[PDB]
Design a protein around this ligand. Structure first.
Ligand SMILES: Nc1ncnc2c1ncn2[C@@H]1O[C@H](COP(=O)(O)OP(=O)(O)O)[C@@H](O)[C@H]1O
Ligand SMILES: Nc1ncnc2c1ncn2[C@@H]1O[C@H](COP(=O)(O)OP(=O)(O)O)[C@@H](O)[C@H]1O
Ligand SMILES: [Zn+2]
Lengths: 254, 254
């Protein structure tokens, strides 16, 4: 299973990705958790501490590796082979979850970032096209880390939105961008739902077959994230809705 | 006088630029004609032949110069000094007009064009910010060759449009992009006008103080361009409208 989880900052899309990764850990022998959004920490929401997460160097900061992979002596290899080296680009959180952090994609007028972006790109391609392992990579609504090439392997793109008109169109633009890239399955996860009136608003704007499931708003996520305590423990009620969502997902992916 | 002439392909914006350059030649000691649109030949519409124009190597094709200016041995200078070398980057059409051809700006996924685009960029900056000489550079509606840095020196941005709703909005987007870049004066030249009804349509959508002048549609430009005969000769009637436009222009620029 190769999953992409995207959403606007603040919708709780990093939280959703962590929950699915947490759930998948039992069903697969190994899983690559890919933090493709620098604005939130996938690792910490997965249980790691600030220190543990920070020690996991981002792809964008692996200067020697980037220089080595992109060549030198006049050489400029923007499509380096890196599949056999992925496990040297992150850490195992436990015996099943391997975390890789993409890092900030810079843009920025006056310089060349081709080699850097080329390295991040080969790793993403290696994760989706070469590796057998399951992969769950989160990203912002722009889903910039994906390309037509990798989009071939993405089993499903999960757009995470909130129950309001604005978030719904943000959700629709993700489905557009994903489609354009060639991703066949784009499904929705409504998060932070507080009432039925919101559920109805979602059902009128979204085909029901495109909806993976709903996750209610629970103050737990906040009072639980504020401290070193995994939020997807049996304690969390909304943890059921996640399981429901996970199963519906595995049914479509086959 | 530093002029930028932009317009959608086919509006005749290369023709307008050539006419102004032709007219300015008498009022200035030297003029840099800059062909910033590969889709049409500024040089040929200025009187050069296919051969003469083709011999004027485009900036984008000066590989040794690009390599030399951007450095080597690990060096990566994306802001090279090139002002003292501009006259080695083109040809004098006559004793007053010096032609420089930008060449195709490539984009194109898999590679690095930073050094190339960096060279074209330093030349444009050298033309607008360093040189005393008058400059008339044409470009497509995207006006991509310009930046906030050079936009400081652009005395006036001339948007060339046709008398129809579509071209008018294309014209407005140019004024937007130019403004965003920081260009203070954006004026319009209506071209290929066939009747008064079209003139009225222009006057209702455009502040009259923003309009430089109109140039009527004359079959001459076509039956004249098809052969080696300068289209801005006293013969051409519309040549007056140009002169009118040129003078109104010099009045605003001071
Ligand atoms: N269902 C929920 N109910 C309440 N708070 C939630 C819920 N889901 C996520 N949150 C909180 O929303 C905030 C942002 O979550 P995060 O996953 O970082 O969003 P994103 O990755 O879209 O920026 C965090 O405080 C997270 O705990
Ligand atoms: N006022 C005009 N009347 C008739 N034809 C014109 C007029 N102005 C330009 N043309 C013709 O329009 C065609 C395109 O001109 P050109 O300057 O190459 O446009 P652009 O640079 O916007 O692509 C040429 O045949 C040119 O002679
Ligand atoms: Zn580059």
């Amino acid at each position: 299973m190769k999953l992409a989880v995207a959403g606007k900052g603040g919708v709780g899309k990093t939280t959703v990705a962590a929950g699915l990764i947490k759930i998948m850990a039992s069903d697969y022998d190994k899983i690559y958790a890919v933090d493709g959004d620098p604005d939130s920490c996938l690792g910490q929401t997965l249980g790691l501490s600030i220190e543990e997460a920070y020690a996991i160097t981002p792809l964008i900061e692996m200067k020697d590796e980037i220089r080595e992979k992109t060549g030198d002596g006049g050489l400029l290899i923007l499509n380096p082979k890196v599949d056999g080296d992925l496990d040297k680009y992150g850490r195992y959180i436990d015996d099943k979850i391997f975390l890789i952090r993409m890092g900030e994609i810079k843009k920025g007028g006056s310089q060349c970032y081709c080699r850097e972006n080329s390295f991040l790109g080969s790793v993403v391609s290696a994760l989706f096209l070469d590796k057998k392992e399951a992969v769950v990579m989160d990203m912002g609504a722009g889903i910039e880390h994906l390309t037509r090439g990798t989009a071939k392997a993405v089993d499903m793109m999960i757009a995470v939105i909130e129950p309001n008109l604005n978030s719904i169109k943000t959700g629709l633009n993700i489905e557009k961008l994903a489609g354009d890239l060639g991703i066949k399955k784009v499904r929705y996860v409504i998060n932070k739902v507080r009432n039925i009136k919101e559920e109805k608003l979602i059902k009128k704007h979204l085909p029901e077959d495109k909806i993976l499931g709903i996750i209610p708003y629970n103050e737990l996520f906040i009072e639980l994230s504020l401290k070193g305590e995994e939020i997807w423990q049996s304690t969390n009620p909304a943890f059921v809705n996640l399981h429901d969502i996970y199963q519906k997902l595995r049914l479509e992916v086959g």
